[PDB]
Amino acid sequence: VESGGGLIQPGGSLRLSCAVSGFTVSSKYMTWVRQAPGKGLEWVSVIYGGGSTYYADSVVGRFTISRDNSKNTLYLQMNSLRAEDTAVYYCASRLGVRATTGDLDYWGQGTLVTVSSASTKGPSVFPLAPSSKSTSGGTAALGCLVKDYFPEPVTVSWNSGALTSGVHTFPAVLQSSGLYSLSSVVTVPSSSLGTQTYICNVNHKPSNTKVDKRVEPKSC
Amino acid sequence: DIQMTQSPSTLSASVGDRVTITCRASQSISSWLAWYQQKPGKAPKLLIYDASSLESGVPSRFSGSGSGTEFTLTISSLQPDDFATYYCQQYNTYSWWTFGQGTKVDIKRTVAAPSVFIFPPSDEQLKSGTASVVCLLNNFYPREAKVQWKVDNALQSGNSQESVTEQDSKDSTYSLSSTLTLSKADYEKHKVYACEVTHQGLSSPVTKSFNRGEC
């Protein structure tokens, strides 16, 4: 599995490694392909069996691909990293020997790189209160906004796990601030809003944050 | 660079369907094109290369055709294992390979407009110096949905982010939350906060809004 990834501040450097067992790295072309969370595949760089190297515009001048045949390992030196380089990075190659130049039938497991200046920070847990604005056919929506935390992950439950159906805890988003945010919502019968309380439980182990937030209904 | 444009963005399908995805190149590339399959959290897998050659061990229900700029990937009878995202890739040039934006093949159901709800910031958050507004789109199909934020009629560009759930294993819908984030100070300077939603199940775009002071 690729390694050398992980967390790094903007302007910083990382060095990915892709150690391979099943074939020699130097008899083949090898490539790096990255994928931002929620996004598609972006080809990053290639090293051909003959030693030539090529780079996508977006990384040229910052990244260097290389291999050490002694250790049977491919590398990607990543310098001057920016937030937009946040992605899962895969090494890839082709094991079938054929006259073709560019298809990829071997892919590593992938390794996450996150580019953020953020330090560890516990979330603020804000209520998303039900009201007329969030009721429809006798069902009301409510939730919790779990904002500005770092790093991942957080866990969210409702009523300490007694309430699971109707719950949608959305994937977190890395904000332009370098902090994460997510929401968790649940739809319940509006007739229940006055007669029963809804609490979201947010745990963020890195910061030792454990918050229970009551989500009171609005009377408008 | 060569831009690869796939369509559709999501292909609705059922087990047994004959499914065809298209991929268009912005420059001619002969047959130098490959198709990949990818499931969430997993690495891609090669299906077809040189437009029409099967990677060995890939089921023969997968086929591809085209050469030049228009290419198709066909699954002749979709299997449960085939619900996934599919990417095309060109390697016409040694110097720069590019992928399409992907086509998600998901579980077909009837069209469902979202229920759209909007949540003003909590008074709680307002004391921290920031104000976030959330727009929830609940239980919609197909996946394509557009959220636009306006503050006193001004289009907001750069202070919002979106998150979507996986297809619901039970009702087969998606849900989406968008968060608009402003300073406390400018939040208290404006009045109307509006989430405009565009979705095929709506006859026209829907706007959910509130005035800051009211509830």
Coordinates of C-alpha atoms in Angstrom, one line a residue:
Chain A
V1 CA 0.0 0.0 0.0
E2 CA 1.1 3.5 -0.8
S3 CA 2.6 5.4 2.2
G4 CA 4.2 8.7 3.0
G5 CA 0.8 10.4 2.7
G6 CA -1.2 12.0 5.4
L7 CA -1.5 15.5 6.9
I8 CA 0.8 18.4 5.7
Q9 CA 0.5 22.2 5.9
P10 CA 0.3 24.3 2.7
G11 CA 3.8 25.0 1.4
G12 CA 5.0 21.8 3.0
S13 CA 6.3 18.6 1.3
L14 CA 5.4 14.9 1.3
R15 CA 7.1 11.9 -0.3
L16 CA 4.8 9.1 -1.4
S17 CA 6.1 5.6 -1.8
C18 CA 4.6 2.7 -3.7
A19 CA 6.5 -0.6 -2.9
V20 CA 5.4 -3.4 -5.3
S21 CA 5.5 -7.2 -5.1
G22 CA 4.5 -9.2 -8.2
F23 CA 6.6 -7.5 -10.9
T24 CA 9.6 -5.3 -11.2
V25 CA 8.9 -1.6 -11.2
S26 CA 11.6 -0.8 -13.9
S27 CA 10.4 -3.1 -16.7
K28 CA 7.1 -1.2 -16.8
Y29 CA 5.6 2.3 -17.0
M30 CA 4.4 3.4 -13.6
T31 CA 2.0 6.3 -12.9
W32 CA 0.4 8.3 -10.1
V33 CA -3.3 9.1 -10.3
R34 CA -5.1 11.1 -7.6
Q35 CA -8.7 11.6 -6.7
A36 CA -10.1 14.4 -4.6
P37 CA -12.9 13.5 -2.2
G38 CA -16.2 13.3 -4.2
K39 CA -14.3 13.9 -7.5
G40 CA -13.0 12.0 -10.4
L41 CA -9.6 10.6 -11.3
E42 CA -6.8 13.0 -12.2
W43 CA -3.7 11.7 -13.9
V44 CA -0.6 13.2 -12.2
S45 CA 2.6 11.8 -13.6
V46 CA 4.3 9.0 -15.5
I47 CA 7.7 7.3 -15.6
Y48 CA 8.3 5.1 -18.6
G49 CA 10.4 1.9 -18.6
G50 CA 13.1 3.9 -20.4
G51 CA 13.3 6.5 -17.7
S52 CA 11.4 9.4 -19.3
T53 CA 9.1 11.4 -17.0
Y54 CA 6.0 13.6 -17.7
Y55 CA 3.7 15.7 -15.6
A56 CA 0.2 17.2 -15.7
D57 CA 0.3 21.0 -15.9
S58 CA -1.2 21.3 -12.5
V59 CA 1.8 19.7 -10.7
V60 CA 4.7 20.5 -13.0
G61 CA 7.6 22.2 -11.1
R62 CA 6.3 20.9 -7.8
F63 CA 6.2 17.1 -8.1
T64 CA 8.9 14.6 -9.1
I65 CA 8.2 10.9 -9.8
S66 CA 11.1 8.5 -9.5
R67 CA 11.9 4.8 -8.9
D68 CA 14.5 2.9 -6.9
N69 CA 14.9 -0.4 -8.7
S70 CA 17.0 -1.7 -5.8
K71 CA 13.9 -1.5 -3.5
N72 CA 11.4 -2.1 -6.3
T73 CA 9.7 1.1 -5.3
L74 CA 8.0 4.1 -7.0
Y75 CA 8.0 7.5 -5.4
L76 CA 6.3 10.9 -5.8
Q77 CA 8.1 13.9 -4.3
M78 CA 5.4 16.5 -3.6
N79 CA 6.7 20.0 -2.8
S80 CA 4.9 23.3 -2.3
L81 CA 1.6 21.6 -1.5
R82 CA -1.7 23.5 -1.7
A83 CA -5.1 22.8 -0.4
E84 CA -6.3 21.7 -3.8
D85 CA -3.8 18.8 -3.7
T86 CA -5.9 17.1 -1.1
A87 CA -6.7 13.7 -2.6
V88 CA -6.3 10.0 -2.5
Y89 CA -3.1 9.1 -4.4
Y90 CA -2.8 5.8 -6.3
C91 CA 0.2 4.3 -7.9
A92 CA -0.7 2.3 -11.0
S93 CA 1.0 0.4 -13.8
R94 CA 0.2 -2.3 -16.3
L95 CA 1.3 -6.0 -15.7
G96 CA -0.1 -7.4 -18.9
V97 CA 2.7 -7.2 -21.5
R98 CA 1.3 -5.8 -24.7
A99 CA 2.3 -3.2 -27.2
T100 CA -0.1 -0.7 -25.6
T101 CA 1.0 2.5 -23.8
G102 CA -1.4 3.9 -21.3
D103 CA -4.0 1.5 -20.0
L104 CA -3.7 0.6 -16.3
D105 CA -4.6 -2.9 -15.0
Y106 CA -2.6 -2.7 -11.7
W107 CA -3.7 -0.1 -9.1
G108 CA -2.4 0.3 -5.5
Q109 CA -4.8 0.6 -2.6
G110 CA -4.5 4.4 -2.5
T111 CA -3.4 6.8 0.3
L112 CA -5.0 9.9 1.5
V113 CA -3.1 13.3 1.5
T114 CA -4.7 16.2 3.3
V115 CA -3.3 19.7 2.9
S116 CA -4.4 21.9 5.8
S117 CA -2.8 24.5 8.1
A118 CA -5.2 23.5 10.8
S119 CA -4.4 22.4 14.3
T120 CA -6.5 20.0 16.4
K121 CA -9.8 21.7 17.2
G122 CA -13.0 20.4 18.7
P123 CA -16.3 21.0 16.8
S124 CA -18.9 23.5 17.6
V125 CA -22.3 21.6 17.6
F126 CA -25.1 23.9 16.5
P127 CA -28.8 23.0 16.4
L128 CA -30.9 22.8 13.2
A129 CA -34.2 23.4 14.8
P130 CA -37.5 22.1 13.3
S131 CA -40.2 24.6 12.3
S132 CA -42.7 25.4 9.6
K133 CA -39.7 25.9 7.4
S134 CA -38.8 22.2 7.9
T135 CA -42.1 20.4 8.1
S136 CA -44.0 18.8 5.2
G137 CA -46.6 16.1 5.1
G138 CA -46.8 15.8 8.9
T139 CA -43.0 15.0 9.0
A140 CA -40.5 17.6 10.3
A141 CA -36.7 17.8 9.7
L142 CA -34.2 18.7 12.3
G143 CA -30.5 18.2 12.8
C144 CA -27.1 19.3 14.2
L145 CA -24.4 21.3 12.4
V146 CA -21.0 20.0 13.5
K147 CA -18.7 22.8 12.4
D148 CA -15.0 23.7 12.3
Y149 CA -13.3 20.6 13.6
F150 CA -9.9 19.0 12.9
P151 CA -8.9 16.3 12.1
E152 CA -11.4 13.7 11.1
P153 CA -13.3 11.8 12.2
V154 CA -16.4 12.6 14.3
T155 CA -19.1 10.2 15.2
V156 CA -22.8 11.4 15.4
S157 CA -25.6 9.5 17.0
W158 CA -29.1 10.5 18.0
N159 CA -30.6 9.9 21.4
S160 CA -27.5 7.8 22.2
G161 CA -28.2 5.4 19.4
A162 CA -31.9 4.8 20.2
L163 CA -32.9 6.9 17.1
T164 CA -31.4 5.5 13.9
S165 CA -34.1 5.4 11.2
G166 CA -34.5 8.6 9.1
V167 CA -31.0 9.7 10.1
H168 CA -28.7 11.1 7.4
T169 CA -25.2 12.0 8.6
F170 CA -23.6 13.6 5.6
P171 CA -20.0 13.2 4.5
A172 CA -17.8 15.9 6.0
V173 CA -16.4 18.7 3.8
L174 CA -13.0 20.3 4.1
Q175 CA -13.7 24.0 4.2
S176 CA -11.5 26.8 2.7
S177 CA -10.4 27.4 6.3
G178 CA -8.8 24.0 6.5
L179 CA -11.4 22.9 9.1
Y180 CA -14.1 20.2 8.5
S181 CA -17.8 20.6 8.9
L182 CA -20.7 18.2 8.6
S183 CA -24.4 18.0 9.3
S184 CA -26.6 15.2 10.6
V185 CA -30.3 15.4 10.1
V186 CA -33.3 13.2 11.0
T187 CA -37.0 13.3 9.9
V188 CA -39.6 12.6 12.5
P189 CA -43.4 13.0 12.9
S190 CA -44.1 16.7 13.6
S191 CA -46.7 15.6 16.2
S192 CA -43.8 14.3 18.2
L193 CA -42.0 17.7 18.5
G194 CA -43.7 18.9 21.6
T195 CA -43.8 15.5 23.3
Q196 CA -40.3 14.1 22.9
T197 CA -36.8 15.5 22.9
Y198 CA -34.2 15.0 20.2
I199 CA -30.5 15.0 21.2
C200 CA -27.5 14.5 18.8
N201 CA -24.4 13.1 20.4
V202 CA -21.1 14.2 18.8
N203 CA -17.8 12.6 19.7
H204 CA -14.4 14.0 18.4
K205 CA -11.7 11.8 20.0
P206 CA -8.7 13.8 18.8
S207 CA -9.9 16.8 20.9
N208 CA -11.6 14.8 23.7
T209 CA -14.8 16.5 22.8
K210 CA -18.1 14.7 23.6
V211 CA -21.1 17.0 23.2
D212 CA -24.8 16.2 23.6
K213 CA -26.9 18.9 21.9
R214 CA -30.7 19.2 22.5
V215 CA -32.5 20.4 19.4
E216 CA -35.5 22.5 20.6
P217 CA -38.4 23.1 18.2
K218 CA -39.2 26.6 17.0
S219 CA -42.8 27.8 17.5
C220 CA -43.0 29.6 14.1
Chain B
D1 CA -5.0 18.9 -23.0
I2 CA -7.7 16.6 -24.1
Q3 CA -11.0 16.9 -22.3
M4 CA -13.0 13.7 -21.9
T5 CA -16.8 14.3 -21.4
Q6 CA -18.9 11.4 -20.3
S7 CA -22.6 11.1 -20.3
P8 CA -24.9 10.7 -18.7
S9 CA -23.8 12.0 -15.3
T10 CA -25.8 9.2 -13.6
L11 CA -27.4 6.3 -15.5
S12 CA -30.5 4.8 -13.8
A13 CA -30.7 1.0 -14.3
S14 CA -32.1 -2.2 -13.0
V15 CA -30.6 -5.7 -12.9
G16 CA -30.9 -7.2 -16.4
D17 CA -30.9 -3.8 -18.2
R18 CA -28.7 -3.3 -21.2
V19 CA -26.7 -0.2 -20.2
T20 CA -24.6 2.1 -22.4
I21 CA -22.4 5.0 -21.3
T22 CA -20.8 7.5 -23.7
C23 CA -17.5 9.3 -23.7
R24 CA -16.5 12.1 -26.0
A25 CA -12.9 13.3 -26.6
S26 CA -12.2 17.0 -27.4
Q27 CA -9.5 15.8 -29.9
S28 CA -9.3 12.7 -32.1
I29 CA -7.5 9.8 -30.3
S30 CA -8.0 6.8 -32.6
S31 CA -8.8 3.8 -30.3
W32 CA -6.4 4.9 -27.5
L33 CA -9.1 4.8 -24.8
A34 CA -9.7 2.7 -21.7
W35 CA -12.7 2.1 -19.4
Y36 CA -12.5 1.6 -15.7
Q37 CA -14.9 0.6 -13.0
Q38 CA -14.8 2.0 -9.4
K39 CA -16.8 1.4 -6.3
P40 CA -16.7 3.8 -3.3
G41 CA -13.6 3.7 -1.2
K42 CA -12.0 1.2 -3.6
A43 CA -9.4 1.5 -6.4
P44 CA -10.4 1.5 -10.0
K45 CA -10.3 -1.6 -12.1
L46 CA -9.5 -1.9 -15.9
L47 CA -12.4 -3.2 -18.0
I48 CA -11.5 -2.4 -21.6
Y49 CA -8.5 -0.9 -23.4
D50 CA -7.8 0.1 -27.0
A51 CA -11.6 1.0 -27.1
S52 CA -12.6 -2.7 -27.6
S53 CA -10.1 -5.1 -26.0
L54 CA -11.2 -6.9 -22.8
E55 CA -8.7 -7.0 -19.9
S56 CA -8.3 -10.7 -19.3
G57 CA -10.7 -12.1 -16.7
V58 CA -13.3 -9.3 -17.1
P59 CA -16.8 -10.6 -17.8
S60 CA -17.8 -10.6 -21.5
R61 CA -21.1 -8.8 -20.8
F62 CA -18.7 -5.7 -21.0
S63 CA -18.0 -4.3 -24.5
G64 CA -16.8 -1.1 -26.0
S65 CA -16.9 0.6 -29.4
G66 CA -15.7 3.7 -31.2
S67 CA -12.5 5.3 -32.5
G68 CA -11.9 8.9 -33.1
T69 CA -13.9 11.1 -30.7
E70 CA -17.1 9.2 -29.7
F71 CA -16.9 6.0 -27.6
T72 CA -19.4 3.8 -25.9
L73 CA -19.2 1.3 -23.0
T74 CA -22.0 -1.3 -23.0
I75 CA -23.0 -3.7 -20.3
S76 CA -25.3 -6.1 -22.0
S77 CA -27.2 -7.4 -18.9
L78 CA -26.4 -5.5 -15.7
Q79 CA -25.5 -7.6 -12.7
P80 CA -25.9 -6.4 -9.0
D81 CA -22.1 -6.1 -8.9
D82 CA -22.1 -3.6 -11.7
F83 CA -23.6 -0.6 -9.8
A84 CA -20.6 1.6 -9.7
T85 CA -18.9 4.7 -11.3
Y86 CA -17.2 4.2 -14.7
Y87 CA -14.4 6.3 -16.1
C88 CA -13.0 6.7 -19.6
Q89 CA -9.4 7.6 -20.1
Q90 CA -7.4 8.7 -23.2
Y91 CA -3.8 7.9 -23.7
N92 CA -3.4 9.2 -27.3
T93 CA -0.3 11.3 -26.2
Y94 CA 2.6 9.9 -24.3
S95 CA 2.9 13.2 -22.5
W96 CA -0.6 13.7 -20.9
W97 CA -3.3 11.2 -20.1
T98 CA -6.8 12.4 -19.0
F99 CA -9.9 10.8 -17.6
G100 CA -13.6 11.6 -18.0
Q101 CA -15.6 13.0 -15.1
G102 CA -17.2 9.7 -14.5
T103 CA -20.7 8.1 -14.9
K104 CA -22.4 6.6 -11.9
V105 CA -24.7 3.7 -12.7
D106 CA -27.2 3.5 -9.8
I107 CA -30.4 1.8 -8.9
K108 CA -33.4 3.0 -11.0
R109 CA -36.5 4.2 -9.3
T110 CA -39.3 6.7 -10.1
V111 CA -38.5 10.4 -10.2
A112 CA -38.8 12.0 -6.8
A113 CA -38.6 15.8 -6.2
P114 CA -36.7 16.8 -3.1
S115 CA -38.4 18.1 0.0
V116 CA -36.4 21.3 0.5
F117 CA -36.0 22.7 4.0
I118 CA -34.0 25.7 5.1
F119 CA -32.4 26.4 8.6
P120 CA -31.4 29.9 9.7
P121 CA -28.3 30.1 12.0
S122 CA -28.8 29.2 15.6
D123 CA -28.7 32.1 18.1
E124 CA -26.0 29.9 19.6
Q125 CA -23.8 30.2 16.5
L126 CA -24.4 33.9 16.3
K127 CA -22.4 34.6 19.4
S128 CA -19.3 32.9 18.0
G129 CA -19.0 35.6 15.3
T130 CA -20.2 33.4 12.4
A131 CA -23.5 32.5 10.8
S132 CA -24.2 29.4 8.8
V133 CA -27.4 28.7 6.8
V134 CA -28.3 25.1 5.9
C135 CA -30.5 23.9 3.0
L136 CA -31.6 20.3 3.1
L137 CA -32.8 18.5 0.0
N138 CA -34.5 15.3 1.3
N139 CA -35.2 12.0 -0.6
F140 CA -34.8 12.9 -4.2
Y141 CA -34.1 10.9 -7.4
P142 CA -32.2 11.2 -9.8
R143 CA -28.9 12.4 -8.2
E144 CA -28.6 15.6 -10.3
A145 CA -29.6 18.6 -8.2
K146 CA -28.5 22.3 -8.3
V147 CA -28.4 24.5 -5.2
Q148 CA -27.9 28.2 -5.5
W149 CA -27.7 30.6 -2.6
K150 CA -28.7 34.2 -2.7
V151 CA -28.4 36.9 0.0
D152 CA -30.7 39.9 -0.7
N153 CA -30.8 38.7 -4.3
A154 CA -27.0 38.5 -4.6
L155 CA -25.6 35.1 -5.9
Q156 CA -23.2 33.6 -3.3
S157 CA -20.0 32.2 -4.9
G158 CA -17.3 30.7 -2.7
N159 CA -18.8 30.6 0.8
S160 CA -20.9 27.4 0.4
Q161 CA -20.2 23.7 0.2
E162 CA -22.3 20.6 -0.5
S163 CA -22.5 17.0 0.7
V164 CA -24.6 14.1 -0.7
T165 CA -25.4 10.7 0.8
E166 CA -25.0 7.4 -0.9
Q167 CA -28.1 6.0 -2.6
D168 CA -30.5 4.9 0.2
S169 CA -30.4 1.1 0.4
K170 CA -34.2 1.2 1.2
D171 CA -36.0 3.9 -0.7
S172 CA -33.2 4.3 -3.4
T173 CA -33.1 8.1 -3.0
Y174 CA -30.4 10.6 -2.3
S175 CA -30.3 13.5 0.2
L176 CA -28.2 16.6 0.1
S177 CA -27.2 19.4 2.5
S178 CA -25.7 22.7 1.5
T179 CA -24.2 25.1 4.1
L180 CA -23.7 28.8 3.4
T181 CA -21.3 30.5 5.8
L182 CA -21.1 34.2 6.4
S183 CA -19.7 36.5 9.1
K184 CA -22.0 37.5 11.9
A185 CA -21.5 41.1 10.9
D186 CA -22.6 40.7 7.3
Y187 CA -25.4 38.3 8.3
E188 CA -26.9 41.0 10.4
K189 CA -26.6 43.5 7.5
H190 CA -28.8 41.6 5.1
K191 CA -32.5 40.5 5.2
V192 CA -33.5 37.7 2.7
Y193 CA -31.7 34.4 2.7
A194 CA -32.7 32.1 -0.2
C195 CA -31.9 28.6 -1.3
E196 CA -32.9 27.9 -4.9
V197 CA -33.2 24.2 -5.9
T198 CA -33.3 22.9 -9.5
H199 CA -34.3 19.2 -10.0
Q200 CA -35.9 17.2 -12.7
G201 CA -38.8 16.2 -10.4
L202 CA -39.7 19.9 -10.1
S203 CA -41.7 21.6 -12.8
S204 CA -39.5 24.7 -12.2
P205 CA -36.8 25.7 -9.7
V206 CA -38.0 26.0 -6.1
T207 CA -36.8 28.7 -3.7
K208 CA -37.0 28.3 0.1
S209 CA -36.2 31.5 2.0
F210 CA -36.6 33.3 5.3
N211 CA -36.2 36.9 6.5
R212 CA -33.4 37.2 9.2
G213 CA -35.5 38.7 12.0
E214 CA -38.7 36.8 11.7
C215 CA -38.2 33.0 13.4

